Structures are given as C-alpha cells and as structure tokens.
Design a protein around this ligand. Structure first.
Ligand SMILES: Nc1ncnc2c1ncn2[C@@H]1O[C@H](COP(=O)(O)OP(=O)(O)O)[C@@H](O)[C@H]1O
Ligand SMILES: [Mg+2]
Length: 278
C-alpha cells in the first residue's frame, strides 16, 4: 500500500515545477491494464528536506490534509500522495471567479481552519500557509498540501526557532517570524489571514500579498525587503479589505493580524466565526 515501485509510476503530466524539484501526475499501474489509480508524485532536481516533509505528512491523517499514499525509493526518495485534480486555490480561483460565491469562500475558510487546527493539535507549525498550498478536492472541499517548511513545536514550548538558510514566504509571515525567527501556532493564524485575503481576491496576481506589500514599501534592495516589511507592519499597515468582502469577514481577517501573537484569534474561534455567517 505505502511502497510504490518506480517502474509502475507512469508519468502523465506536470502539476507543479520549482527550481529544486517538481510535482507530477502519475498512474501507479502494476497490472499494466491502465486501471491503476492516479497519484501526485513529489520529487527533486533539499534531499534531507523532502524526507522531513515525508516524515511529517506520513504522521498526519485528516479530512482537510492532503492524503499521504507512500514513498518511492531509488538514496533519492519520492513522495506519493492523493491527486486533487482541481489543483491549488491559486490555480482554481482565477479560472472559477464567476462560479465561486461568498458562501463557497466561507466553506473553504472553515475547511482550511479545520485542517490547521488538526495540525496545531499535532504540535506542528505549517510555515507556508498560502493559497498555492491549499488544494481543491471539489466545489465544496479543500485540503492543506505542502509540509516542506513545517516544524514541530517542542512539548510545553510556545514556538519553534528557525535556524536555517532556506527561502521563506515573507509576505505571508507574522512579525515575530521576520524579526526573531519564532514560529507559534498564532504565526500560522497570521498566514491564514493572508490566505483568506487571497481567497477573497480570487488569487488575482495584481492583488497578491507580495504585489500589494511591495507597492506599500516602495523601491527596495532584496537584502532590505524584510526590514522594510517589518517597519510597514509596525506602523499598523495591513492588506486592505477586498472589495465585496463583508465587514464581518474582514474583522475576522483583522483578528489574524494583531501584531503580538497572543492577541490573535484561534483557529477554533475562526471556525465558529465563519460558521455563524453560513
Ligand atoms: N496532491 C496534489 N494533487 C494535485 N496537485 C498538486 C498536489 N500537490 C501539489 N500539487 C500542485 O503542485 C504545486 C506544487 O506543490 P507543493 O507540494 O505545494 O510544492 P513546493 O514545495 O514545490 O512549492 C501546487 O501548487 C499544486 O499546484
Ligand atoms: Mg507549494
């Protein structure tokens, strides 16, 4: 069930491609009759990073967390998971602007929040909660997908300190992350507020968190981007209320963006908040 033979993973097409690896659509077909199930295969070309990601995903089992299927061994390793045909929200929302209404957006918000609350109960900080990492199973079901930057918060500890040279989604990050490299469950609540904004703007590229924040901070050298961003956030500046987003949804977004981590709302309070609106 969990061990996939490389010779039976028949590549169909690419789903995602980055500088250091890719995600492909395959059919695991050991019978050769073309009746095998379609899977999403994550690979490289960082090695220890994918194994950590495999380790975490392997230990998570939830309705709103992408289903781990298994691995494919070479030293190299491949992550096998369920294929969600509609892909990420970053892909889905621009193609379905006319099809998706507020009720539906709220239904995804609750779903994201349930997967995140499950994740926090497992003592994990996602560290990459963005629309591009929220996968669409159906018109009414989404699942959290990429555990590449995910870290376990030690028992009785409030946060994890990120000590490394890896790239980070700074435009989705809470001030403590940018300033001290501290990652609390409340840091994930911050990223959720940024994700909710993307979800309400239908992932319009011109209104993306990076594009709006870069427009706020003006001309900057890359080395000064995070400091310029820290300062914008210290002044009280936030992503504006998306047009046609009701105040009741914006106040819940604002509850995700309280400067101090302890002043932010919980994922459970967010679930209850969106449910009252449905
Ligand atoms: N299980 C899946 N089913 C379908 N598409 C997927 C799946 N996992 C990832 N993808 C697609 O591949 C892209 C990259 O995958 P992700 O694992 O989030 O990557 P990374 O760490 O490279 O950015 C996603 O944005 C989505 O478009
Ligand atoms: Mg991703």
């Amino acid at each position: 069930p969990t061990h996939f033979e490389k010779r039976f993973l028949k590549r169909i097409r690419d789903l995602g491609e980055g500088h250091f690896g890719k995600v492909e659509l395959c059919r695991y077909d050991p019978e050769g009759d073309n009746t095998g199930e379609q899977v999403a295969v994550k690979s490289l070309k960082h090695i220890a990073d994918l194994k950590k990601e495999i380790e975490i995903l392997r230990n998570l089992y939830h309705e709103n967390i992408v289903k781990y299927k298994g691995i494919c061994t070479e030293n190299g390793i491949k992550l096998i998971m369920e294929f969600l045909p509609s892909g990420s929200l970053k892909e889905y929302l621009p193609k379905n602007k006319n099809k998706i209404n507020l009720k539906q957006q709220l239904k995804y918000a609750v779903q994201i929040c349930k997967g995140m609350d499950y994740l926090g109960s497992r003592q994990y900080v996602h560290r990459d909660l963005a629309a591009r990492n929220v996968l669409v199973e159906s018109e009414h079901q989404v699942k959290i997908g990429d555990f590449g930057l995910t870290k376990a918060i030690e028992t009785d500890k409030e946060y994890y300190t990120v000590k490394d040279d890896r790239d980070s989604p700074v435009f989705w990050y809470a001030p403590e992350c940018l300033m001290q490299s501290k990652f609390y469950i409340a840091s994930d609540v911050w990223s959720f507020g940024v994700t909710l904004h993307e979800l309400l703007t239908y992932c319009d590229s011109d209104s993306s968190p990076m594009a709006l924040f870069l427009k706020m901070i003006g001309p900057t050298h890359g080395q000064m981007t995070v400091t310029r961003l820290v300062n914008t956030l210290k002044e009280g500046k936030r992503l504006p209320c998306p047009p046609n987003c009701p105040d009741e949804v914006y106040q819940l977004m604002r509850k995700c963006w309280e400067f101090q981590p302890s002043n932010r709302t919980s994922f459970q309070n967010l679930i209850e908040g969106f449910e009252a609106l449905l």
